[PDB]
Write a protein that binds this ligand. Structure first.
Ligand SMILES: C[C@]12CC[C@H](O)C[C@@]1(O)CC[C@H]1[C@@H]2CC[C@]2(C)[C@@H](C3=CC(=O)OC3)CC[C@]12O
Ligand SMILES: O=c1ccn([C@@H]2O[C@H](COP(=O)(O)OP(=O)(O)O)[C@@H](O)[C@H]2O)c(=O)[nH]1
Length: 421
């Protein structure tokens, strides 16, 4: 077999779409080794089914306390320790042939090439948002805005780096650095499909031979509480459930959590709300145990792909991370957009104004219950919500074609697989 190594940035929004690509490639007969940090592996609860090997490297460092310092420490430790790991893997058959690494770690290309491997950069954000990082690197823009093949943007629609305060400068450099060595990359992979963003993919394809391979999602390494979640959803009728999740990193204040809580209660809809276990203690005092009980399931993590695929889910209140955006679109699920920072602001603009499968909430800097309640009504009940559902069903059909035989993403994964020879 041809042996592929995969190195995500250590966060679930980066591990998961690479994991899904790895599962596809394992299906085609490739051997996969996934490289994770010690800290990621502590959270890994199921892996036997994948048949992929998992190797761990030290964390190398928490990162938000000083982004400029700890990202550089993580980079140096990752260079050193993936070099050591590759050296050990070169004592075993089949020898590794290619390293697919997260696009935010472009210096890993140098480790791939120094070890005799091909290097594939795996972008976990769409071409439209990645275009912004390239223009930042060219100096065309810095942290109304007109960029080629993107809709007119307000300042609020640009990737939100200002929210990171002191880390703002370091975060901006990191995002731009994703393109610093793109001419030397052996394979440029994007987790998107052409029909989603035809013009910016075409523009990008005139500069480098990019491979759009998305959605990579078709399944989980972490605890998803699958049985409880799917049994609860199986008790719900079609189009009755609001799925609420702010992803794996974003943290809402107690003041914001209460507005969300009251909005979901006052809405009188059924809701499944992922509140991560370290965020639980900010919910109103009796919410999880009694108040949420008549209409809601409050759970620390869920099988988001299966939840979004469930016919009972009427819409998705989301922070607009790209995986959650792409998953809802491929599932035909319209959204309520509550972006927090980074690319989420840009994603929310694309959801609402380009793909037209969601609405956005207006802050007052706290989003109020009645605003969230208005958005629920717009989606669940209003005629606007029916058009958003019809647009989402159209995108699902195009994503379906993309990953099926003859589709753009299936062909690109086939071209990549065949290039490995
Ligand atoms: C800064 C912050 C904020 C949430 C936490 O509380 C504290 C964090 O340091 C955790 C790290 C995270 C996040 C912010 C997003 C990042 C830039 C993210 C991305 C890399 C990329 O290519 O695409 C986005 C991973 C690294 C990141 O800086
Ligand atoms: O209860 C949950 C919530 C999220 N996810 C997954 O976690 C990832 C979140 O990625 P995203 O890009 O949306 O935002 P981030 O967590 O990076 O901020 C996605 O794979 C979701 O499907 C999940 O499996 N269960």
């Amino acid at each position: 077999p041809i042996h592929i190594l995969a190195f995500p940035f250590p966060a679930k929004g980066h591990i998961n779409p690479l994991l899904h690509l790895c599962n596809r490639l394992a299906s085609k007969g490739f051997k996969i080794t996934l490289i994770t940090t010690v800290s990621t592996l502590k959270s890994v609860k199921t892996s036997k089914a994948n048949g992929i090997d998992i190797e761990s490297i030290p964390d190398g460092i928490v990162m938000e306390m000083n982004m400029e310092l700890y990202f550089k420490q993580f980079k140096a430790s990752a260079i050193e320790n993936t070099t050591k790991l590759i050296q050990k893997l070169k004592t075993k058959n089949p020898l590794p042939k290619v390293l697919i690494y997260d696009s935010s770690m472009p210096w890993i290309l140098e480790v791939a090439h120094e070890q005799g491997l091909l290097g594939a950069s795996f972008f976990t954000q769409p071409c439209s948002v990645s275009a912004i990082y390239y223009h930042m690197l060219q100096g065309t823009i810095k942290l109304m805005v007109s960029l080629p093949y993107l809709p007119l943007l307000e300042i609020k629609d640009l990737p939100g780096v200002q929210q990171f305060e002191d880390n703002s400068e370091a975060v901006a450099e990191l995002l731009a650095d994703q393109f610093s060595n793109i001419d030397d990359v052996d394979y440029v992979l994007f987790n998107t499909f052409d029909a989603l963003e035809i013009e910016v993919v075409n523009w990008m394809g005139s500069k480098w031979p990019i491979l759009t391979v998305g959605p990579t999602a078709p399944n989980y390494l972490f605890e998803t509480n699958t049985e409880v979640c799917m049994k609860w959803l199986d008790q719900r009728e079609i189009d009755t459930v609001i799925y609420v999740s702010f992803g794996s990193l974003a943290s809402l204040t107690e003041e914001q959590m209460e507005q969300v809580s009251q909005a979901l209660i006052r809405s009188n809809c059924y809701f499944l709300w992922v509140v991560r276990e370290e965020e639980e203690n900010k919910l109103p005092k009796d919410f999880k145990e009694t108040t949420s009980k008549k209409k809601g399931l409050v759970i620390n993590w869920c099988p988001q792909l299966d939840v979004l695929a469930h016919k009972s889910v009427a819409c998705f209140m989301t922070h607009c991370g790209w995986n959650s955006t792409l998953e809802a679109l491929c599932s035909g699920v319209p959204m309520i957009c509550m972006p927090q920072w980074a690319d989420q602001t840009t994603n929310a603009k694309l959801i609402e104004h380009v793909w037209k499968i969601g609405v956005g909430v207006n802050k007052s800097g706290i989003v109020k219950r009645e605003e969230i309640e208005d958005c629920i009504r717009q989606v669940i009940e209003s005629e606007r919500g029916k058009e958003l559902k019809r647009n989402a069903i159209k995108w699902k059909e195009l994503a379906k074609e993309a990953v099926s035989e003859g589709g753009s993403s299936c062909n690109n994964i086939q071209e990549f697989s065949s290039s490995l020879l």
